[PDB]
Amino acid sequence: PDYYEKPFNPDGVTPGSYKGISQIDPYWAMPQLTAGSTADPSSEHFYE
Amino acid sequence: GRKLSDEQSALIARRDMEFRVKDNLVELNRFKNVFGVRIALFVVESDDPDYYEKPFNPDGVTPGSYKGISQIDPYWAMPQLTAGSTADPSSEHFYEPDFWIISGKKYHRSHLVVVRGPQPPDILKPTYIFGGIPLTQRIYERVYAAERTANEAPLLAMSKRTSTIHVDVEKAIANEEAFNARLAFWIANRDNHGVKVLGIDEGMEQFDTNLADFDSIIMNQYQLVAAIAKTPATKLLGTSPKGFNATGEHETISYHEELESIQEHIFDPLLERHYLLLAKSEEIDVQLEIVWNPVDSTSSQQQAELNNKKAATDEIYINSGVVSPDEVRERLRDDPRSGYNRLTDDQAETEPGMSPENLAEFEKAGAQSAKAKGEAERAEAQAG
Amino acid sequence: AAERTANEAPLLAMSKRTSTIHVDVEKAIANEEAFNARLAFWIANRDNHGVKVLGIDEGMEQFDTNLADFDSIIMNQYQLVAAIAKTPATKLLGTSPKGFNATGEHETISYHEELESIQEHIFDPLLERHYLLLAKSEEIDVQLEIVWNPVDSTSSQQQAELNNKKAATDEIYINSGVVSPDEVRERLRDDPRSGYNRLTDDQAETEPGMSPENLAEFEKAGAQSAKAKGEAERAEAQAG
Numbered sequence: 001p002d003y004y005e006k007p008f009n010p011d012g013v014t015p016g017s018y019k020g021i022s023q024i025d026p027y028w029a030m031p032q033l034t035a036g037s038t039a040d041p042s043s044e045h046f047y048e
Numbered sequence: 049g050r051k052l053s054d055e056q057s058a059l060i061a062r063r064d065m066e067f068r069v070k071d072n073l074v075e076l077n078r079f080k081n082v083f084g085v086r087i088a089l090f091v092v093e094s095d096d097p098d099y100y101e102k103p104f105n106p107d108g109v110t111p112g113s114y115k116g117i118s119q120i121d122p123y124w125a126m127p128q129l130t131a132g133s134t135a136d137p138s139s140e141h142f143y144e145p146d147f148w149i150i151s152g153k154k155y156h157r158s159h160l161v162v163v164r165g166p167q168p169p170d171i172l173k174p175t176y177i178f179g180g181i182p183l184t185q186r187i188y189e190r191v192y193a194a195e196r197t198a199n200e201a202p203l204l205a206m207s208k209r210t211s212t213i214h215v216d217v218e219k220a221i222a223n224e225e226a227f228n229a230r231l232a233f234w235i236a237n238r239d240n241h242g243v244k245v246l247g248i249d250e251g252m253e254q255f256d257t258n259l260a261d262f263d264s265i266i267m268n269q270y271q272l273v274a275a276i277a278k279t280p281a282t283k284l285l286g287t288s289p290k291g292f293n294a295t296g297e298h299e300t301i302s303y304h305e306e307l308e309s310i311q312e313h314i315f316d317p318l319l320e321r322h323y324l325l326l327a328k329s330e331e332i333d334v335q336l337e338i339v340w341n342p343v344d345s346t347s348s349q350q351q352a353e354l355n356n357k358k359a360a361t362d363e364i365y366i367n368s369g370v371v372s373p374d375e376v377r378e379r380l381r382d383d384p385r386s387g388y389n390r391l392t393d394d395q396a397e398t399e400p401g402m403s404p405e406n407l408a409e410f411e412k413a414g415a416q417s418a419k420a421k422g423e424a425e426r427a428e429a430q431a432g
Numbered sequence: 433a434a435e436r437t438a439n440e441a442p443l444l445a446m447s448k449r450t451s452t453i454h455v456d457v458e459k460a461i462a463n464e465e466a467f468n469a470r471l472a473f474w475i476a477n478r479d480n481h482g483v484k485v486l487g488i489d490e491g492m493e494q495f496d497t498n499l500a501d502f503d504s505i506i507m508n509q510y511q512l513v514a515a516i517a518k519t520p521a522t523k524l525l526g527t528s529p530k531g532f533n534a535t536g537e538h539e540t541i542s543y544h545e546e547l548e549s550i551q552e553h554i555f556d557p558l559l560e561r562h563y564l565l566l567a568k569s570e571e572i573d574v575q576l577e578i579v580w581n582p583v584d585s586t587s588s589q590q591q592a593e594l595n596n597k598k599a600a601t602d603e604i605y606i607n608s609g610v611v612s613p614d615e616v617r618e619r620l621r622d623d624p625r626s627g628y629n630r631l632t633d634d635q636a637e638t639e640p641g642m643s644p645e646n647l648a649e650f651e652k653a654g655a656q657s658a659k660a661k662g663e664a665e666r667a668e669a670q671a672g
Contacts, residue, residue, distance in 0.1 A: 013568040020140045021562070025170050028137040197442045204449070212484040212492055220485070235483060249488065257449060261499045265445050268503055272438060275525040292527055293534045302523055305585050344588045357592040358627065364599045368606050369644040370613045370620065370636060371628065379630050400613070400636045401644045413648040420655035424662030431669035 051378070052334060063326060072117050073315050080163050080314065083122050085179035087148070088161040088318055090325060091115040104158035109328045117322070125150045127178055143170050145178050161318050187276050194269035201262040208259065213252040263290060278306060307343045341384070355387060369401025434509035441502040450495040453486070503530050518546055547583045581624060591625055609641025 003012070037045055072088075080086040092099075092113045099108075127145035134143065146157045165180030220227050234244065246252065267289035274281035280299040281289060288294035316338065323336050346354065365371040374396040380386045402410070460467050474484065486492065507529035514521035520539040521529055528534040556578070563576060586594065605611050614636040621631050642650075 010564070010568060013565065015569055015571055018565055018569040022138060022140045022142075024137045027171075193439070193442050197445060200446060207479050209480045210478075210484065211482070212486055214486050214488050214490070217485070217487040231483065231485070235481065238481065253492075255492075255494050257494075258496060262445065264503055265441055265499065268438075268506065269442065271525070271527065278526075280526055288527075291530065295534060298522055298536055298540065299526060301585055301587070302526075304587070342588060346588060350589060354588055354592055357596050361592075361596050361599045364603055367644065368603055368613060370602070370606075370617045371631075372634075375628070375631060379628065382630065398634075400617075400634065403644075406644045409645075409648045413651050417651045417655035420659045424658040427659075427662030427666045431665050 051382075056332060059330065060326070063330075067116055067322075069117075069319075069322070072119070073318070075119060076163065076318065077310065077314055079119070079121075080165060080180070081183050083179075084165045084176070084182035084185075085122055086163050087120040087122070087125055088163070089118045089120060089155070090159070090161075090321065091118055092325070100153070100155045100159050103156050106324070106328065109325065111329060111331065114325055114329045117318075120150060122177075122179065143173050143178065161321055163314050163318075183277070187273070190269070190273050190276060194266070194273050197262070197269050198266050201259065201266070204257060204259055204262075208257050209254060211252070211254050213246070213250065215247075215250050267291070279303070304343050311340055311343070351385065355385075366401060366403055367406070369406075372400040373397040373402060434506065434513055437502070437509055438506050441499065441506075444497060445499060448497050448499070451492070452494075453490060453492045455487075455490050507531060519543065544583050548580070551580055551583070586625075595626065606641075606643050607646070609646075612640040613637045613643065615640070 037043075037048060040046070076086055076088060092109070093115060094108075094110065094113060096102075126149035128147040128149055130146045132139065133141055133146050136142070144157070148155050148157075148160065165183070168176050168181060244252075270285055271281055271289050271292065274284050277284065280296065280303055281287075281292075282294070282296060282299070283303075288296075319338055323338065326332075327334070327336055362371070362376050366373060366376065377391070377396045380388055381391050397407075484492070510525055511521055511529050511532065514524050517524065520536070520543055521527075522534075522536060522539070523543075528536065559578060563578065566572075567574070567576065602611075602616050606613065606616075615638075617631065617636050620626050620628050
């Protein structure tokens with residue numbers, strides 16, 4: 001029910017589950033920032 | 049990956065002949081450029097009243113049902129949006145019209161083939177009624193400007209010089225119908241090597257106009273028009289504009305590349321769908337693929353040293369054994385540009401590298417080897 | 433800026449020439465509708481070879497505008513526009529701008545360089561993940577990657593002269609035994625620009641140096657060697 005919410009795992013691929021490619025305009029998507037990404041600049045994942 | 053027999057080749061050839069495929073392709077591209085969106089419909093006769101309602105089924109084709117291709121102008125059809133198409137941006141078919149209204153008849157999207165020009169953003173799609181950006185909208189203003197600038201020059205040239213004289217107009221209007229007659233006589237008989245006589249209190253002056261700058265403006269406008277249409281000016285105008293280089297080395301390359309892009313994008317899907325439907329309609333149990341001829345066009349000479357260069361390469365390969373005498377034969381047979389196009393059904397040598405000279409030395413080397421082998425054994429008779 | 437500057441010139445060309453006449457306006461407004469009629473007749477029938485009659489106290493004067501400077505401005509603006517887009521102007525406008533030399537050799541190289549930069553950066557990760565996920569979904573238990581075709585575009589003459597030069601390289605290595613005839617046949621098969629795409633499933637000779645002429649000289653040298661050795665023992669049969 002929440003596969004996209006979990007982090008990606010290649011081992012979870014169901015045969016025939018792949019359907020196609022979807023592209024979204026920027027005004028339909030709103031990014032969300034967590035406390036982990038804004039912890040300290042020493043983190044490799046700072047500000048995305 | 050192999051060549052089909054002659055009977056179905058002739059069948060497909062004639063079928064395409066009475067279907068006017070090339071006309072359909074040309075009109076498709078032309079009206080797509082003109083209107084920004086074009087609709088292609090494939091007519092297939094079925095007994096189901098709602099065959100077009102159901103999504104297209106490849107296996108639903110009945111023999112001999114196909115009839116041809118029809119194209120619909122934008123102002124006849126009316127798109128319709130289902131709830132799923134406008135459900136959420138996550139869908140792969142967001143803002144994709146899944147139904148079209150043509151004179152009250154419903155057609156599913158899968159049954160149609162729609163080609164689009166430039167793609168507007170999603171928010172601008174409803175304004176364009178889910179269509180591409182028209183080229184006429186992009187070009188009409190500049191076309192008008194260029195045409196008006198071109199037309200203006202002869203009008204100024206026709207009135208380049210004006211001549212005026214001064215005279216006591218009171219005495220002129222005192223008794224005219226003779227003053228006018230005299231001046232009309234002068235105008236009628238006016239030329240060089242004649243003398244005009246005036247009084248001491250009058251004068252005469254002339255004015256001109258310099259027209260030595262219109263050409264640059266006209267050529268700049270025409271160059272801009274050529275730039276808008278993504279076509280070299282040497283085709284629209286038939287000559288490079290004045291003062292511009294006419295090397296055309298990269299221009300022809302870019303034009304050929306654009307033509308290849310058009311071939312890949314617009315003509316490929318309709319042709320693929322047509323050929324699939326035709327093959328399924330006439331019991332053709334072979335899968336078909338489309339290969340395009342080279343877009344570059346050359347005169348007879350360039351063809352001559354084109355063919356010779358490949359011929360030289362072929363001899364290098366066959367003597368080295370990498371290729372065989374046969375596989376070059378049908379390669380030449382498949383190429384229509386090759387000079388030899390009336391080939392028979394005869395077959396050449398199939399073994400790789402067995403040239404007539406290579407085959408000649410095949411037996412000569414082996415035969416001498418046996419003689420050499422026996423001689424050593426014959427030498428072994430003595431000293432033993 | 434470039435578009436408005438381009439649009440300005442034809443309008444000024446339309447309004448290039450201005451003509452004026454000085455008359456006694458008081459008399460003209462004393463009784464018009466005939467002055468207007470006469471002037472309208474003059475405008476309607478105006479051309480060269482015609483003469484205009486004026487009073488002794490009147491005068492006529494004309495003006496004109498020089499429009500020989502717009503072209504350089506327009507081409508400079510368009511050159512800057514093409515510079516911003518990191519694409520040669522010869523493709524945006526179709527020709528090199530006025531006054532700029534048109535060698536164009538290095539600009540094609542720069543555009544090509546930007547082209548494989550785009551190919552490596554934008555297109556590569558999406559397509560790579562797509563192929564990985566397709567392989568996982570379609571139970572294809574083979575690891576695969578992506579290799580890119582050359583970015584340049586060539587004509588028939590250029591392609592033919594390209595293939596001919598490569599053929600010489602193939603022949604020189606085969607005679608020296610660097611590569612095997614099949615190992616270049618497969619390369620010839622996979623090349624898209626190569627004419628030979630109808631190759632069958634047959635396999636050619638597999639070990640390097642074993643060329644059709646290298647066949648013949650091999651057995652003769654091999655066979656003649658045995659003959660010479662046979663004579664060696666035959667010769668030594670006598671003299672001891």
